[PDB]
Structure formats: C-alpha cells, structure tokens
Amino acid sequence: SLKDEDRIFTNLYGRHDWRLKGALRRGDWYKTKEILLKGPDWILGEMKTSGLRGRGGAGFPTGLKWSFMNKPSDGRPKYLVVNADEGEPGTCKDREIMRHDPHKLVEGCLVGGRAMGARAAYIYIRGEFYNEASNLQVAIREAYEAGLIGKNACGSDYDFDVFVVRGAGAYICGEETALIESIEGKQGKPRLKPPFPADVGVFGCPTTVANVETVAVSPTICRRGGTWFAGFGRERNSGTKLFNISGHVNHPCTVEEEMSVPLKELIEKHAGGVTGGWDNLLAVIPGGSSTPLIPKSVCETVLMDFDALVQAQTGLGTAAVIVMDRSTDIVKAIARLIEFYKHESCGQCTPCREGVDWMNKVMARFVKGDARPAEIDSLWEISKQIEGHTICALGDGAAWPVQGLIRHFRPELEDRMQRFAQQH
Amino acid sequence: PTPEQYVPYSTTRKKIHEWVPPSTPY
Amino acid sequence: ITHTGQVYDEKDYRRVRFVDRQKLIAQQPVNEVEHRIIACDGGGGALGHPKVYINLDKETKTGTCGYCGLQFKQ
Amino acid sequence: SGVNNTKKWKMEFDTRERWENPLMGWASTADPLSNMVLTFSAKEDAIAFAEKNGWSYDVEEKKVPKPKSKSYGANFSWNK
Amino acid sequence: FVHRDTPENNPDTPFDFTPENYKRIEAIVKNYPEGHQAAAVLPVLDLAQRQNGWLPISAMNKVAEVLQVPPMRVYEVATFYTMYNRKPVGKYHIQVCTTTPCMLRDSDSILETLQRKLGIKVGETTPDKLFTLIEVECLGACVNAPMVQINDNYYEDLTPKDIEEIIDELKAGKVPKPGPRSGRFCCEPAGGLTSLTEPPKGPGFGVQAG
Amino acid sequence: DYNTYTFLDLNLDLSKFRLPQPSSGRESP
Amino acid sequence: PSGEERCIACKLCEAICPAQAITIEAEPRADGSRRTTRYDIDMTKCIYCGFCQEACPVDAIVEGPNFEFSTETHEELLYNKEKLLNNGDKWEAEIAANIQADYLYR
Amino acid sequence: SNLIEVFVDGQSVMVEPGTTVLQACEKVGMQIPRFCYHERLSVAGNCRMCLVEIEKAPKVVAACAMPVMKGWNILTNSEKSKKAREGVMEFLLANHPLDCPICDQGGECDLQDQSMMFGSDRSRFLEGKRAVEDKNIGPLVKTIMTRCIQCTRCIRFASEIAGVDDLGTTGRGNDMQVGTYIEKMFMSELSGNVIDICPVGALTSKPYAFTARPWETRKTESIDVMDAVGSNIVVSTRTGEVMRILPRMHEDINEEWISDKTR
Amino acid sequence: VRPRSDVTHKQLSAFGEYVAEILPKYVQQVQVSCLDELEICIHPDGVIPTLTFLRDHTNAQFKSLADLTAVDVPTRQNRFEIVYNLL
Ligand SMILES: Cc1cc2nc3c(=O)[nH]c(=O)nc-3n(C[C@H](O)[C@H](O)[C@H](O)COP(=O)(O)O)c2cc1C
Ligand code: SF4
Ligand code: SF4
Ligand code: SF4
Ligand code: SF4
C-alpha cells in the first residue's frame, strides 16, 4: 500500500514541530534553489509526469491547469491563489496540512509561483479557522526571516511574496471564481467561466487556484521526482491522498494513505472498522456532501479513486468518507445537506436559488412522510433542472445527494410516504 | 329559502383643470 | 355623494338629469398571526382571490393583501 | 424586451377629435379612419398604397439597434 | 437583511478605529496590491468586528469611508458573510455545528446540553450577555465531530458532559482547554495510530537525482 | 492560544518583508 | 363579505368583452388599494355572453339570475358602478348560492 | 477577416470575433429568450433562462455570455434547450406572487409571455411561497419587490447607466432582496428608467400606478420638449388623455432612456 | 395531436402533380398543406380552364363549388386572393 518512506506529508497528527526548525529536520526546503533553477518548464514536466490530479473538489490534471497560465505575460502580474477554505462538509483534510506542516505549504507556494511566474500568492484560509491561520502566518514570517521567501528566495533570483486572506464563513467562497471575488473584496459570488481564471483572475490579472493539498505535494513531487508519485496509483488517479473518515466508525481519522485503495481496506486497515460491524452500513458518502452516497452492496466492490467512482456514479471529490449506519434516517441525513445548501448558495443564479429551496421544502416533507409517493420522482426532475443549468458547480452538488437518495433508497422514502398516510 | 329611475352619470372627476383667472385686478 | 364623490355640480349642465328622478375594510379588525408570512385566500379558496402570501414581518406595518384590503397584525 | 412587434411596417392615419360624451363620459370620435392601421411588409409596398388611395404620406426610415460589443470578461477589468 | 434606525444602532452610534486599530487597517491595505484598497473591505470589516461585535450601521459607514468604497459595497459584504454580526452578540457566541458529520455523533445532544445549561434556546442570547447560541454549519474539523466553536476556540470531539464543563469554565473563570477533549492525538485514530510510525525520513532521503 | 489581534498584528510585522505592490494604474476601479 | 367591493380593476373583463360593452378607468384609492373609479356596462351593447363571468380573477363581475330588467328609457339600460354594485347587493344571496352550486364545475 | 463563421441551426451567420451566442442568434434572425440581459447593460448571467445548446457539446451554454467560437451550431429550438427553459421558468414562477391583476406590468411582462412561450403549462410547486418587505425607493418608483426575479438589471443601470451606485444585493439564498440596505431614496435623474428596465413589475411607476393597462393604450411616437436633447419618446394615450410617456429608442439622441422630468 | 393519416397526404400530393402536369400553363404553385388540403394556385387567366378541368375530368370530378372568397392582402401588389374551394 504505502510506506512511511514513501509519504508526501510526513508531519501529520503533529507530534512534531510545525516550525521551520522541525520542518527542516523533517527535510523541507531542500535544494529549493536548484528546483527553481531547474526552470518553470522542468517543474511542469515533473507535475505532468507525476500525473498529480487536483486534490480539490474536482480533480483536473495539475500539469495542464498550471500550464495554462504558463503562457507569456501580457504586462499584468500573474498570481497564485491557494484555497485554504475547508468548506466541504466532512473534510478536515486540509486543516491538517496548515496546522501541522505549514512550511511545506510555504515552499509549495514558492515552487508554485516559479511554475507560473506569480509575483505573489494569497492563501484564503476560512475565517472560521482563526487559530489555524495565525500558525501559518507565523511560519511564513519565519520563512521570510530565513530568506526562504521574499526577494531572491533562497538566493534564487525569484521574488515571491506570500499572503493570508481572511474567509468569512462561506462555503461558496471556496469556488474558484468566487474565491477571487472575495479576494477582490466584492460579494463572494462565482463569476462565469468563459473568461477562464488563467486569462483573467484575481484583480483581473492572470490567476490560478489550487486546493491546498495540490500546492503542498508539488515540492515533494518535484524533489522526489514524477515517477515516484506516478507509481503509487493507476492511470490518472495516481497519487498519495489524505482520506478522511468521519462517522459511524470505530476511529475517525485522516489517514494519508495511498490512493486507489479498496474502500473496505481504507476503513479497515485504518479507521478501525464500521461501528457496529461492516454490515451496519446503510450507505457511504465517498467525496463529502456534494458527491452522491453509495449504498453498502456497491461499496466494497468499488475502491476510492476518481475513475472508479465515476464508473460508480459518485465523485472522489474531497475524498471525505461520511458513513451512515443502519441507525440513521437518511431521508433526514440528506435533508440537512439540502438545508446545508439553502443556508449557503449565493442566489446569483435562478436554478440554484429557487431550486435548492424547493428541494429543501420537499425534502423536509419527505422526512415527515407528509408528501405523496408521486412527489419523489418529481424531485428527480427538479434535481436535473438544477444540475445542468447552474452558473457554478454548487447547484451541481446539491442535485447529486438528492439523486442518490432516490436512486438507491427509493423504497424507504415510499414507506415514510406510506407510514404517514396510514395514521392519517 | 325558508322618480326612482336610475339616472346614468359619469363617476370620474374633472380631469383637466383650468387656470383660474386671478381675482386680484391689475 | 358617491364613492369617488361624483358631484354633478349646481352649475353643471348635467345635473339636469336627476330632476324628478333620484341618483368597510377600515372597519375590519386586524387579523393577528403567529407566522412571519401568512396567506390570504380571500376566504373560501376557489371562491376567493388568487392566493397571495403577505409578509407580516414588521409590526411597523400590518400587511394588506392587495386584493382584500385586510390588515394583518403580525 | 421582445422585438417581434418591431418587424412589419405599419401606416397609420393622423389622429383626430376625441371629445368626452356628456351622458356617460365615454370617449367619442367623429373620425372613421382613426382605428385603422394597415400593416405592410415593406416600405415600397406601403408607399404604393398611399399613392393609389391618394392619402398623403411621410415615411420614417426604420431605425434598428446598432450592433453593440459585449463580453463578460471586459467588466472584470479593474483597470477599467 | 434590512437595517432600520434605532437608537442603539444608528450612524449616530460612535465608531472610529483606535489609533492602534487604524494602524492595523493600513497593514491590511498594502498586503493587497497597490492601487487596490477595495479588496481590503472584508479584512477591515473584520477589525471593525474585532473592535466591537455589534458592528452597527455607523461602523460599516466608517469602513466604507476608510476604504473609500461605495457604502453599499460594504453593506453587501457584511450581509453576505455570517462571520460578521450586524446585531450585538453575547460574550461567547457559542456556535454548534449541526450538519451531517456532527449530526452523526449527536451534535444535537450537545446542542441540547448547551441549551439546557444556558437555559436558552438555540438562536437566543442569555440575559447575562456572555452567551449566544447559534446552530452553525460545517466548521471543518469533522474527524472530531462533536464540536463547538467559541470565538475561534474550536473545541472538538466533545461529549455532552465536556460541553457543560466548558460552559462552566466560561461561566465563571478562565477559558477551557482550547481544542479537543479526548485521548485521540489530534485527528489520529481514536486509540493511538497505525501510520507514520517510522521516524521522519532525513532531508534528501530518496531525493530524485537532480 | 491567540488573542483577537494576533493575526493582524502579525501581518503588520510581515510588512518588513514585502516588495512594493504593483498597481492597475487608476485612481479607483 | 367584509364589505370591500371585489373588483380590483385588472380590466381584463374589459379586454375579453366581445361587444366592447364594459368601460373601466381606475386610480389608486386613498387606501392605496386599486379600485375602479368608473365601471360602465352598456347592457344594450352587451350580448350576455358570460365571458366576463369567466375572465374575472376575483370573480367580482357575475352574471346574476334576474332577467326581468326591461326599462322605459334607453339611458336606464346603460349601467354605472353604483347600479351594478346596488344590483350586486340586492341579488348577492342568490348569486352566492348560484356560484356555490357551479364552481366545482368551473 | 475577423468574421467567425458559426452556424445558427445551419445558417452560417459569419460574425465578428467576440460575438456572444445570443448576438449570433440575433443576426441570423432569432431571439433567445432572456431575463437578465439588456443590450446597453453589462452581461451578468443571473437568470440563465437563455441556456442554449451548441451542437456536439455536453452542457448547454449561456447565450448572453459564451463568446461564439468557430464551427459552433447554436441549436436553439432543440429538445434540450426547451427543457432548459421549461425548467427555469418552473423556478422563476415558483417563488413568484401571483398578483398579475395587481401587477400593472400586466401585458408589459417579459415573464408571462416568456412563460406562455418558453414555459410549461402547469405548476408543481406545491410548497409555500416567499414574501419580501415593500420599502420606499422614492416618490416615483413603487417597489412592490416580492415581484423581483433577482435579475440585477437595476443594480447595473443604477451603477452603469446612471452613476448612483446605491441599489445593491443584500444577503444570500432565496432571501437575497435587491433593495437599498438602509432606506435612502433613489434620488437621481434617469431614475424612472428602472421601471422600464425591470421586466418584472416589482418596482413600477407610482403616479401611473393603476390608471390603465397596456393593451388599451394607443401609442403615438413624438418628441421630448422639456429639455434640449430632444429625446425621442412614445406618448401612451387612452380615450384622449395622456396616461404615460416612456422612451422609444434613438441611437444618437436618447438610446432607450428619458429624464425624470419628461416622464 | 390531430390523427393525421399519411395515406391522404400522399394521394393528394400525387393528384397535385397530376394537375400540375395536366395544366402546366396556368398552375404556378401546388402544395398539400400539413392540414391535408391541396391548394393549387393558378394565374388569373387560368380561372376558366383549371376549374373546367376539375369539374369535368374522370380522374378528378369536382362537381360543387363550396365557396368563392377573396382575402385582401394590402401589401400584395395584386390585393385580392380569390380562393375557390371545390368538392
Ligand atoms: C460550492 C463550491 C465550494 C467549493 N469549495 C472548495 C473548497 O473549500 N476548497 C477547495 O479547494 N475547492 C473548493 N471548490 C472547488 C474549487 O472551485 C476549485 O475547482 C478547486 O479548488 C480547484 O483545486 P485543484 O485544481 O487543486 O483541484 C468548491 C467548488 C464549489 C462549486
Ligand atoms: S449555483 Fe448559482 S446560486 Fe448556487 S452558488 Fe453557484 S451561482 Fe450562486
Ligand atoms: S371585474 Fe373582475 S375582472 Fe373586471 S376588473 Fe374588476 S376584477 Fe378585473
Ligand atoms: S357579458 Fe360580460 S362579456 Fe359578454 S358582453 Fe356582456 S359584458 Fe361583455
Ligand atoms: S410580473 Fe406582474 S405580471 Fe408579470 S407575472 Fe409577475 S405578476 Fe403577473
């Protein structure tokens, strides 16, 4: 599977100094100058060969993504935006990187810029995490002191000035076009994609956005080479990823295990075991709230890699595993996720604004069982109207859990329908 | 279940109002 | 005289007509409610007005369904 | 914002007296050709109708919205 | 989402960044790109919130003034984000995560415990003005599900008893242990861990050649 | 282990290590 | 029932009148509500189609049961809002019963 | 040169670079249904009622927004782009208060017609509706804003055509209400245009509140005499008294806008 | 959806060509509408000839005149559109 010798993030769960001294001891900032000296090209070949997929909600080939803003500058400073907003529910994945191994992030940002000529990078850590940022800020201060970051980084002529931006409790801020607008200081509402972020981004200057995990692994991969990373996985879903297990399991934890490992093994080797026995598994949410939940019979068969999941009709996403024993009212579980999205969508687009509120009202009635059985496929149809028509992906995300509940748990919802009709 | 003729008329008002000449002579 | 006070006048050339021939919600209590928003079928559903939902959200103003003129006291 | 009523040419006769009616206050008109608006597909055909029917005509050229350049990316420009 | 003049909250309410605060304000301005100050409205609005939790209409007006932006521009930012409070809040503003990860593991019970001790319903503030309870959504840190963020404290993995205990420390005395209250080391598996046992590999270990 | 003004003050300190930022070149967007 | 006349001057009863019989002009009553200053059904113009009964959203204008309203003078047949409202008050009890019987059908 | 050749259903209307999907449809001759897009107002994409289906493409595109590319075929009357309108109109109408016989933009509604032409025959929103709180934007515009389809045209005009920059969106979710956060009247010339530009009858004219209904109004095209710009205007007369004066477009003089004084 | 019987659409189309070939001289346009109706259009001079062929032809006997009408398209140079419907 994965050996400690072969691990990208090697300071998880603390136990070690998050400061530069400890980070250096661990082996961070190694020949960083040489890396930059290798030249932006060399870094993207590394990432490309690495097959590092985006560790964010949606995995886009890192190499290509970074490559786009590798086109010649048109007189506007290129920029780096690192989304440190851990918005996805069930995902404490990133919080760990910054809190425990921040300096890795710092170097990653530097390596990141060299890859795309960003004078500076801005890290949008969610405002909720006030404590988390301070630590990161401290580490950054130290790196400037070391000369690691700032003018002539590591002596290399490259000049990089990293920043930390306060989030303000919005899941949508996380979106790529909306992170920018929050950075820009306007309301956090995703812009459209046709002018892509590379071409126009933060402050209308070439900009690129990466999940903090994606920025963090790039230096280790650069130093340790693309092949190493490439070997651990299969085809595209190739790489080491932090997988989180939260809910109805013996030991919730963020493992860090290698990718494409059997769902069972992940929750078996680590995570203790499904609380109450593997057979007490009403369903598994593989990528977090946005991805559709998969019921037990499908799960062990399938494993956690993006290709395998899309075959399964679900998304690897943030790889946040939320598990539901046979002791849970799923109709109400998914219902609160729709409540999670009505309290959160920006309302900029018509399909998400009214559609997500419409499903919330129907879902609440479904939990009570007040609604008739015919309404259940009605919500199917409302779901796909929202799925393909939304300006951003959150409407994409709201539709999928609804679709999953109807797809695998249609008989249970009908019974809740039946239960209320009987008592009158 | 166990003189009075309705005279028709317009119920709207004056609409266009003309300018009253000033009663102050000049 | 009438609703919009039609007053064919002492000098009009139309008041001639009547010669020898002749020519509530404010009183309605404010419907107190518990919910922020309330409906107003007009009373009787199909036999009322197209149902509208009024926002009695500010005690400052008693919502008035544009159809019944009924004031609702939050 | 629909433009389906700005397609065909129409020729309309000049407006005339609309005095109030004393008994009921209804509008009253003495001009027969008032409500008549004939619709003609092209300017040339409408001009022909006026000439053979002997009515005077004063044609107004169609004015169509000028092409306007729009692009979502352009307003995102902090510069301007 | 509408503001109405009230003696307690009006432009009349006095607000001005402390000499120390104003200093902070500029620090924010240069962090952002030159010629760009508008981008700092949020960070600044946050320091107005740091100054005073209420952040009344007067405070937003000043923010727009200091940041020379359309005032509405600040009003829109304050309304969109839940982090900013446009109403006075209690001293603690206990925020309970009640979304799927936390729902699982009974966050509601924790809510009940909190409500009981505070003798107040969710979304209501104690007359003591030290406590204000709100049912917030995913606050991150799910591996530790039972959770209640208190002014960033982010206590984690809490059992109902711990919650009341925490309130006790806050109710009369110093703050409780910032962070989780369980045997698990951070987000290590509850009883110990089964990963990263090997000592950290040496700098340059298995470094790809050149 | 941090007071409310820990971050901003830290950021003020970070200024000793930052180049003069660039500008779009206008008085106000 | 409260006493507020049902018509809210949407004026589509005027729009669908085949004979051009109904003439409606309106202005906001001081209450701020919307009411018709003048509502004139010319019964001699009217061909009693019953579409107005159909069209009204609040169902303010109804085809009342009485058929015996023959009048000595032509002017009496022209009806303003006050005659129709008075006609409405006189026959409201039967009109309500009639609408009660036929609304399920409509 | 600079003539992208794109097929609007096969018409190969060659357009200049940067032509938006919608613009190509206009040139070929069609008119993609649309709520948030005004020609002289910035593209916002809020409604997404204009979703069309470029051929051989997985998702439908935003007409007002996608710059048309080379080789595209903007299938407009496809089986998909109609489910992309039959399902949006489902949403705009769901939270809408049905007071169409109050809404004096009765026949002047770009939302009933588009519903009657690009919408569905019936509703499935068995749930409850929302309501917002009517406020005062001034003595000319009556904002019965429970009507608002959050199309952000006003916030644009009030910032782009007129420099008021006051109207703004407040909040998120289904209670985003586009009204001044504090009650400050929208006092500016060019103010009344908001009426004409809001396709919904949420905010309409207060003097011309309920005096008429548009089918009746006989429309005579004339010239503004209040100011020397000589703005073109249409005087809407019913039974012989003027009921409203609203702008008519003159590219050079008043391009769809008229002053607060002359209306 | 109306119960269209393609059987008709074809047979009437076929007659439309038949007539078009039989009287090349006066028939300008012939079309069977989607409403399953044929509307031969003839030059005004063909009024006598086209009718007579339809009244007295074994393969097309159109004995009675249902109606003679004239729509008026003012735009059209030839204002009136005399329409003769035959059974
Ligand atoms: C509603 C919404 C919320 C999102 N939240 C996050 C987030 O909290 N963190 C994140 O990295 N990406 C988030 N994303 C995805 C980003 O927009 C972007 O696609 C991703 O961060 C790209 O990172 P990668 O290229 O490293 O995969 C979100 C997307 C949507 C639609
Ligand atoms: S979907 Fe439409 S509404 Fe929901 S967030 Fe993305 S943009 Fe805002
Ligand atoms: S009568 Fe019914 S329809 Fe005619 S106006 Fe009054 S309300 Fe509208
Ligand atoms: S019945 Fe009602 S609609 Fe029919 S004509 Fe008389 S008035 Fe017009
Ligand atoms: S806007 Fe006024 S008219 Fe158009 S639909 Fe909504 S209510 Fe009916």
Ligand code: SF4
């Ligand atoms: S008010 Fe009219 S214009 Fe302004 S947003 Fe609501 S709908 Fe669009």
Ligand code: FES
């Ligand atoms: S849902 Fe409460 S923190 Fe993950």
Ligand code: FES
């Ligand atoms: S018009 Fe295309 S998005 Fe509103």
